[PDB]
Design a binder for this molecule. Structure first.
Ligand code: FMN
Length: 315
RNA sequence: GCCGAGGUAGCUCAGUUGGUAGAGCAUGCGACUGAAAAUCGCAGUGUCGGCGGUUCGAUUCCGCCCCUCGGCA
């Protein structure tokens, strides 16, 4: 039993184990997702570097990308061992890299392939195998086509469908595919109405917790990506209102704990910028936030963070 | 001439071991205590130096070519 009500979207070059730990200091309940991790990188690459994460990041789900059923079943078997509570399948990445590899959003073209992929992964691991998909391809999406492909996946085992509510135009850039196609959140709402036994987590364009709450009164969950990264404290009230916990974090308290987390990591071989480049938005839209962001991007050291914290305390 | 170590936004630069490329300062527009300081948001644009090599595909790895650099000659 997992809590799908709220989560931070998987974002390449964003949601590494460092930023995930940061978000965990802001919200205890919010579900975290790893970056898209290709199956071949899990099978042949340094597995400790890729998948190893901290136990504080629980709950956390490893998202895998691929096309070969046997390769994704082996990659899901490996992810489960590292302790991931969930193995999510990437069916939305419209990059040129994805199209050439035949994985991501272009996998939606072939339900027969996607269904044998899901059957293999689900039987290879005991953790819930989910999916993060898009509404369709080349703006040719129909509601009966999306509901029909969701039916097939559900018969393959899938229970949770994290839906990025917008089509993927393979011709456009990746940054263009997250701003141009129309957001049909109402399509996901109807997916819950046609499939009340399934869990749907709508996603796309959610700017605040107030908007996320609106969508929660219609579907099971909401996923925020750029809203969280651009300013982690967009989930400031997430715990208290969504997860019903009695705790509201302070931007300064979180900075104090992120400093101690930076001391452990740096002191055991972690480059200081690997942790500091994700703390720049901690004071976004706050007094003297500029100087906080300047100090860390210039110094890039524990000592620099100590002087930046001291200033924030003075202010 | 042997070599250290580099070519990424205008700028000083990150990118840790092939997989949805971006930090800072500075340009530009904007919010605000009254113009105004202080303060903050918004967006920006990439042939990741050119040529082949592997690959599903490499800013990332090979060889070649190639501009500023530093000790040795
Ligand atoms: C920088 C960036 C990287 C992303 N990488 C992934 C990814 O690796 N896997 C994935 O399923 N979605 C990825 N996405 C898409 C997000 O998961 C999400 O669907 C999209 O940002 C829209 O949701 P949002 O408006 O709440 O951010 C990425 C988005 C961004 C902005």
């Amino acid at each position: 039993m997992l809590d799908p009500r709220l989560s931070v979207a998987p974002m390449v070059d964003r949601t590494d184990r460092h930023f995930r730990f940061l978000v965990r200091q802001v919200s205890l309940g919010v579900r975290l997702y790893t970056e898209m991790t290709v199956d071949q990188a899990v099978l042949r690459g340094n597995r400790e570097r890729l998948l190893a994460f901290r136990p504080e990041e629980h709950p956390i789900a490893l998202q895998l990308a691929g096309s070969d059923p046997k390769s994704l079943a082996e990659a899901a078997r490996i992810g489960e061992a590292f302790g991931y509570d969930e193995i999510n399948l990437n069916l939305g990445c419209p990059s040129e890299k994805a199209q050439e590899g035949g994985y991501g959003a272009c996998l939606l073209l072939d339900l027969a392939r996607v269904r044998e992929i899901l059957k293999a992964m689900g039987e290879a691991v005991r953790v819930p195998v989910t999916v993060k998909m898009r509404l369709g391809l080349e703006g040719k999406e129909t509601y009966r086509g999306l509901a029909q492909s969701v039916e097939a996946m559900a018969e393959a085992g899938v229970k949770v469908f994290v839906v990025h509510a917008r089509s993927a135009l393979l011709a456009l850039s990746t940054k263009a595919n997250r701003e141009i196609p129309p957001l049909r959140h109402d399509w996901v709402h109807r997916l819950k109405g046609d499939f009340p036994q399934l869990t749907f987590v709508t996603n796309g364009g959610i700017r605040s917790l107030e908007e996320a709450l609106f969508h929660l009164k219609r579907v099971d969950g909401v996923m925020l990506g750029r809203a969280v990264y651009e300013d982690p404290f967009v989930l400031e009230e997430a715990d208290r209102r969504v997860f019903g916990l009695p705790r509201r974090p302070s931007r300064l308290e979180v900075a104090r704990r992120m400093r101690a987390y930076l001391e452990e990591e740096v002191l055991k071989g972690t480059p200081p910028w690997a942790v500091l480049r994700h703390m720049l938005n901690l004071f976004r839209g706050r007094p003297k936030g500029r100087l906080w962001r300047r100090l860390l991007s210039e110094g890039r050291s524990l000592q620099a963070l100590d002087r930046a914290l001291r200033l924030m305390e003075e202010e």
